[PDB]
Structure formats: structure tokens, C-alpha cells
Design a protein around this ligand. Structure first.
Ligand SMILES: Oc1ccc(Br)cc1
Ligand SMILES: Oc1ccc(Br)cc1
Ligand SMILES: Oc1ccc(Br)cc1
Ligand SMILES: Oc1ccc(Br)cc1
Ligand code: SF4
Ligand code: SF4
Ligand code: SF4
Ligand code: SF4
Lengths: 444, 418
């Protein structure tokens, strides 16, 4: 006659301890300014009138053009102008709790490295939870507590790894502390991230200082909505992306406060501080893939990541190998469907394709300037590679009577989305049992 | 979805009122009123009630307890429950976000970082492209589910449930002085284009036709630990879910060409709005009891001129069940809940007289919070419609504390949205 079981799947494919990422001697920490979103070589893109602008402003011009022409995406006619409008209103509102598309500035706005000034900390100050020494130092108990809190805080997946500094940005993109929001985009700077023998995360005029005791990284997966992502590259894919960034932000703040009130310190990050995919792989959420994302058993790549760094003692999780690398070796669906041909069809190498790649680690090397170039053209955040990946299909797992396996057969419109199935936070009750959690699967 | 249609009433507010009903000044709630605000701690020192409750939380942690007379596994566990509770409140100002047009509860999006970033697109400046209330109701409910509501309904705004005067703070007062500088400010309805605040008044436009009410489900296993710390924790986390819902949904409504007023625990009485919007029925304890969650669900609401189709109120027999049940009243640690019949006369200043309801003594309720060091919730926990702490921490959990064994009950398609 067997119903899907993520705990069994993860146990079946668990590896022995050790970072799965393969590196050589060319590896150096990566300056965040090099990402396509920020680097001068990629930052500017033409709009549909040929005017060269910051990429997100050129994308804005295309969003406005599509609404006026009753389109939900590039050459994709909406039911009417009102439907086109509704999709961009949903997208825009999803970003409500996110600063400048990613919350990357460390220790600014929502991403504070200390809780001292937050209104919640001030209200609770008489209890002294953030000043009382920890009552628990046992990593086993702390891992159970912090993972339970993580699920409360909106994570669909949570894992723990030792912090690998190779993936922490050599220098962050940030703004001076005295610069108000309305000037932030004009006053962005770089600032080194360094590790020193200090008791608490602290920021000087010159440096963002992470303590040498910052042992661990907690990684969260924030599930996006399948029906909406499958509209990629059209507006509804932008909306599930946007809403999950605000979920990421709430997660980080909730969890950091929990960790602080347990007597440790905690650094939030969302898209800042370090490379989420690498942390997620080392924390066992999933495997790296040809497109470059972390592919998870539960959601494929259709899941966002955030992470929190802490000195709280924790038990690292085991990495997972459910065969993604070998599937990506033969699949190439994302490479073939990518509207900008940004994804390589070749083998993995240690050699960066351009400045946006960190050389010295074995991965599929993609041209992320080509990817970013398609966003102003399509007026969105694309996501076609996520949408076409077979691992994004909700039912890829089958049980053969003995064990779990991937179904190889899987590798061979917006009005209906607005009118169709939805549930709280865009989660799907047909799959929400995938992420049920008991102590047995939080810590062994 | 068929249960709720099975029990739909015809249109019309189910709340029975008389000639004496008047709008209720928010200062009168037990949380804020000077007759109920100060309570002794366990040492006998009289303080603001939440400060006396803090002292009990400290004392329990030190004594390795999760609640009154309830030993924890160890001090570490006691600490963890209070750390979780305190963290849950991260996105909430001074227990409830009640000050209108302050902090998270802004009546205009114009100064929000999100609005500024999106300004070149001009979605908040562009006239509505959709005025059909049917399509708007489908769009905004879909948005509401994305925004974290497990239940959503629409009603015409009954001004009887809007506070006559809000509790707020002067606009330039910093957060650190807020608790000490709370003031009263009238909420009035005038012929103005947009919601606006003057030195003297919070002005809601006469065009503000509708209220959208959201139900935000709490975790059943955690609330079952009431009056102990883990029921405090699911309470707290849902207040921050409430705040994110309000901001997300207001931004959606504004980017659609309308205005939107958030509220969380402020602006007006959530239980009344929820009953008129069809989420559930009023109950003996005073809460809105829903078919999906019983009373184990928090409420928030957003006010807007967006054309919408009002939902029908529902009758699935709560009133007749509450007549004979009285379990909440017998389990209530403070004897706050009446065993008697419904009347139009409030028992004290904390009740709004003029509406038929079970009249409860809410000062007796609040008095149990400093004694127990939490937000109680025993009434919610024992209610039949709702159906140790180490086992909760070691037991089932899922995203936002939702439960996959019941999450299918809140699936939604267009047919059940409008
Ligand atoms: O991950 C993302 C970052 C920025 C934008 Br805009 C969209 C997606
Ligand atoms: O007087 C006080 C009021 C509130 C807090 Br919190 C601390 C002190
Ligand atoms: O509704 C609530 C208001 C204040 C507290 Br403290 C807890 C719950
Ligand atoms: O020059 C700018 C105009 C609008 C934005 Br948003 C950012 C920069
Ligand atoms: S589409 Fe195919 S090659 Fe691309 S990431 Fe998914 S499985 Fe790998
Ligand atoms: S987001 Fe789009 S353009 Fe970018 S890699 Fe994926 S498919 Fe290609
Ligand atoms: S919260 Fe507790 S004290 Fe208050 S009415 Fe309910 S049972 Fe009684
Ligand atoms: S416990 Fe009984 S009387 Fe009290 S609200 Fe629930 S059903 Fe009604």
C-alpha cells in the first residue's frame, strides 16, 4: 500500500561529521561588495528605454510599464490592469519588514548586534534575563530549546553548524551609524568583519567585531509558496519571495532575543554577514546545486535562508547527502530554462567565473551578472530556475517498501493563483506534516 | 468550509444592544485604569501590575518553577520558559500595540522604510485600478492569509465598538518615557480624505466603511499549560504575529489605492468586530469562540475604505452551550467569570454596559496575573471548544506553533473567500 516522512528521509541520508564543501588553497574570505547587487560592474542596468540606472530602479520602470499595459510579467498579459496592480501591491507589501532588499547592513535597523536598545529589551529589563548568567550550559538541552524557539519564530527548517569563517564576508556593505534611512542607499560603505578576543559582539568606527567565542551558526529555512513560485518570472513569484524576507527578519529578531534572554549573545544577519547557502549545507539543511541554491528534501530550493551566530553551546547537525550532486550532474533543467543563460552546463570547478564568485571552493560556477541583468528586463526577481527544478515539486519522494528514493520520472496562470489554494503564510497543509518536529529530531 | 456555510446567519449584527449603549473609553480597561493598575507583588510592595508580575517571574526562576506552585524540571527549564515568553513580544509595544498612529501602528504608510523604498513605483499614490468589492474581497483575503491570519472576515464598521477615546502618548515622546506619559485622546469620525491625527484628535474618515478581522491561532499544547509560562509564550509570539499582520495588510491595502488603519489591541473592541465579521460567537468567558480554534485564537483588525463584501455572522450554538457549561467560571482562579445569565448591565467600570453579554469582573482577572506571574489563560485552556511543561518542550511543534493535524481546516479557495 506509505506516507511521506522527512525525519526518516533525513536520517537515511545523514552523513558523518565534517564540512562537505571541498576547498583548495586559493580560498579567501569574500568581500560582500562583490555580489552582483552591489558591485559597480553589475549594479547599473538599462531600463526598457535604454537609460542606465541602479538595477532596482530600472526594474521599477518595468513594473510600472507592465501595470499600465495590464501585464503580470514580461509579455504575460494579466486578466486586466487591476489584476496586474494587485500582484505588484502584494509584492511591495511583502517587503514591509526588510531594509533595502535583504537587511544586509550589520548592526543597523532590524539587524542589531545587541538587544540593549530594542523596545522589547527595555520593557523586560526589570526581569534581567539578558543580564543573568545562563542557567543552562548543556549543549544537548540548549539545542532542543533553541530549535523549539526557532519553529515558534517561523522557521520551517532549522539546523546547527560550527561557524566556518570561510563563509563570513571579509567586509560588509553597511552605512555609517549617523546616516538616516532616507540617505542609506546613497551612503553605503564597506566595513571589515573581524574576529577578536572580546566578550560581546561590538562595532567600532573601523570594524565589526565578532568575538572569538562565537562558536556556532543556527540556520533557518523559510518556505516559499509553490503555486506562486511556479509563476516565475511573473509578479506572484516576487510576492512569495518578498513575504519570506519579512518572515526572515522576524525570525532573526525573535531568535536573537530568545538567545539573549537565555544569557548568551546573538548576531542576526538575514542576507548579510555571510554566505547563507554554505552555512545551510554545513548545518545539514540540504545540498548545493547546479543553480547555486541549497536544495532541501522538504522544499527543494524553494525555501529562503537566514542565520544567527551565537556562543550558545549547541550540538552541530550532520550534513546530508540525498544525491543532489549526481542529479544536478545529469539534469541541467535550470541551465536550459534560465532566461539569461547564467547557469553553467559544465562541470564543477574551483575557479570563479567572475568577481561575483568566491574562488577556491568546488561548485557550479554561474554568471550572476547575467542573472541580475534579467531582473530589470522582466521587472521581478525571476526564480525560473527554482520553479523548474524537479526538487521544487511537492511529491518527489517515494518509498519502495525498504527505503526512500527520488522519483526519476520528475527529471525526464496568475488569475488561478489568486482564485486558488492558499493557507496561513502561504504554507500548504498537504505538505505541512513534512516539518512536524519532536525532540528526537531536534537533538540526538 | 462547509461547517461555516452550514451555520451562516442572515445579515445583521448579532450583538443585542439597548438605548443606553455608549462608546467606551479605552482608559477603562483593567490594564490601564487607575483603580486596577497598581497591584502588590509577593513581598507586599505596590507597583504597576506588570512590574509586580515581573517580580514573581524572577522569584519563580530562582526557585525553579514554571508557574505558581509548579516546580520546573530545574532552574534551566524555568529560565527557558520566561526567555521564550519575553522574546515572543519582540514586535509589540508595551503589551498590545494600543497607542494608535505610534511605532508599528502608523495610520499612514508615507514614512515607512518600505514605502520610501518603493516610492518610485507610486503604488500608494496611484488611484485604485479595482473598485469591485467582490474582487477586492478576494484579493485582500488572499493577502491576509499571506500575512499570517489563520482566519479572516469582513464586516461593516460598527462605531459602537470603537473606543470613544484612545490611550496613547504624545507624538514626540521617546519610547523610554512612554509608560510614564500615557494620555487620553478622542477618536472621532469626520468628513476628511485620509485618516489624520491632530494635536487634539484621532480622526477616522467617514468613508471608513469596513473592518477586516484576523484570527491568529495559538498553540494548543502550550496554552494547555496555563497559568504557567508556556501559555505566556504562545500568547506573546502571537502578539508579534498580530503586528506583522497589521503592517503587511495595511501596506497591501495602501498599495492598492486605499487607506488602512492598523490596530492590534487598540482602537476598538476586537471581540465585537470578530463576531460581526463571522469569525465566531461571543462566550461566557467573554472571548470570541471560533469553530476551528475555540477561543484559543488571538484577534487583530484593520479599518479601511476599500470596498468589500461583508461576511455573514455565524451561529453554531455557542450561546446555548455556554448557558449550561460554566466550566471556565468554575476553573477561573480568581472567580472573575460569572455563572449567572447575560445582562445589559456591566459589573464595574471595565465593562461596556448596554450590550447583552456575560458580565465578568475583569479586575479580579488582572489581579491573578501578578500572583501567578503570567497571563493566566485557564479559561481558554479548559473550554471544550478549544480541544507538563517538559513534555511540551520535548514534544510536537511546527512552524509558528501551528499543527499539521488541523492545518487543513484553514485551507482557502476563492469560493470561501467571497
Ligand atoms: O533575494 C532578493 C534580493 C533582492 C531582491 Br529586489 C529580490 C530578491
Ligand atoms: O517605572 C518603571 C516602569 C516600567 C519599567 Br519596564 C521599568 C520601570
Ligand atoms: O493581551 C495581553 C496584554 C498584556 C499582557 Br502583559 C498580556 C496579554
Ligand atoms: O535616487 C534614488 C531615488 C529613489 C530611490 Br528608492 C533611491 C535612490
Ligand atoms: S534544475 Fe536540475 S540541475 Fe538545476 S538545480 Fe535543480 S536538479 Fe540541479
Ligand atoms: S533567477 Fe532567473 S535569470 Fe537568475 S539564474 Fe535563475 S533562471 Fe537564471
Ligand atoms: S484569564 Fe484566568 S483569571 Fe482571567 S478570566 Fe480567564 S481563568 Fe479567570
Ligand atoms: S468553558 Fe464552557 S461556558 Fe466557558 S466559554 Fe467555554 S463553552 Fe462557554
Amino acid at each position: 500500500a506509505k506516507e511521506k516522512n522527512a525525519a526518516e528521509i533525513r536520517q537515511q541520508f545523514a552523513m558523518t561529521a565534517g564540512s562537505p564543501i571541498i576547498v583548495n588553497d586559493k580560498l579567501e574570505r569574500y568581500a560582500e561588495v562583490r555580489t552582483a547587487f552591489t558591485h559597480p560592474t553589475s549594479f547599473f542596468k538599462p531600463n526598457y528605454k535604454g537609460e542606465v540606472k541602479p538595477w532596482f530602479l530600472s526594474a521599477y520602470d518595468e513594473k510600472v510599464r507592465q501595470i499600465e499595459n495590464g501585464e503580470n510579467g514580461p509579455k504575460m498579459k494579466a486578466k486586466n490592469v487591476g489584476e496586474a496592480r494587485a500582484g505588484r501591491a502584494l509584492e511591495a507589501a511583502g517587503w514591509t519588514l526588510d531594509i533595502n532588499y535583504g537587511n544586509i547592513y550589520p548592526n543597523r535597523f532590524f539587524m542589531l548586534w545587541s538587544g540593549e536598545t530594542m523596545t522589547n529589551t527595555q520593557l523586560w529589563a526589570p526581569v534581567g534575563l539578558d543580564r543573568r548568567p545562563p542557567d543552562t550550559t548543556d549543549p544537548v538541552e540548549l539545542t532542543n530549546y533553541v530549535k523549539f524557539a526557532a519553529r515558534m519564530a517561523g522557521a520551517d527548517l532549522v539546523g546547527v553548524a560550527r561557524l566556518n569563517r570561510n563563509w563570513v564576508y571579509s567586509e560588509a556593505v553597511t552605512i555609517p551609524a549617523d546616516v538616516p534611512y532616507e540617505q542609506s542607499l546613497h551612503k553605503e560603505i564597506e566595513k571589515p568583519i573581524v574576529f577578536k578576543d572580546v566578550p560581546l559582539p561590538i562595532e567600532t568606527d573601523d570594524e565589526l567585531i565578532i568575538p572569538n567565542t562565537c562558536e556556532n551558526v543556527i540556520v533557518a529555512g523559510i518556505a516559499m509558496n509553490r503555486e506562486m513560485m511556479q509563476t516565475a518570472p511573473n509578479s506572484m513569484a516576487c510576492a512569495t519571495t518578498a513575504f519570506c524576507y519579512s518572515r526572515m527578519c522576524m525570525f532573526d529578531m525573535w531568535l536573537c532575543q530568545f538567545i539573549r534572554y537565555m544569557g548568551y549573545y546573538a548576531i542576526p544577519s538575514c542576507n548579510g554577514v555571510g554566505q547563507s547557502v554554505a552555512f545551510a549545507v554545513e548545518a545539514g539543511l540540504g545540498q548545493a546545486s547546479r543553480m547555486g541554491a541549497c536544495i532541501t528534501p522538504e522544499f527543494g530550493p524553494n525555501v529562503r535562508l537566514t542565520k544567527v551566530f551565537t556562543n550558545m553551546p549547541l550540538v552541530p547537525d550532520k550534513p546530508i547527502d540525498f544525491g543532489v550532486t549526481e542529479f544536478c550532474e545529469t539534469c541541467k533543467k535550470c541551465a536550459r530554462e534560465c532566461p539569461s543563460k547564467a547557469i553553467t552546463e559544465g562541470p564543477r570547478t574551483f575557479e570563479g567565473r567572475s568577481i561575483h564568485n568566491q574562488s577556491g571552493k568546488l561548485q557550479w560556477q554561474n554568471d550572476y551578472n547575467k542573472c541580475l541583468g534579467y531582473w530589470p528586463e522582466s521587472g521581478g526577481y525571476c526564480g525560473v530556475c527554482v520553479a523548474v527544478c524537479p526538487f521544487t515539486k511537492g511529491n518527489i519522494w517515494i518509498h519502495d517498501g525498504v527505503e526512500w528514493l527520488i522519483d526519476n520520472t520528475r527529471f525526464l496562470n496568475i488569475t488561478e493563483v489568486w482564485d486558488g489554494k492558499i493557507n496561513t503564510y502561504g504554507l500548504d497543509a498537504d505538505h505541512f506534516r513534512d516539518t512536524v518536529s519532536f525532540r528526537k529530531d531536534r537533538v540526538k
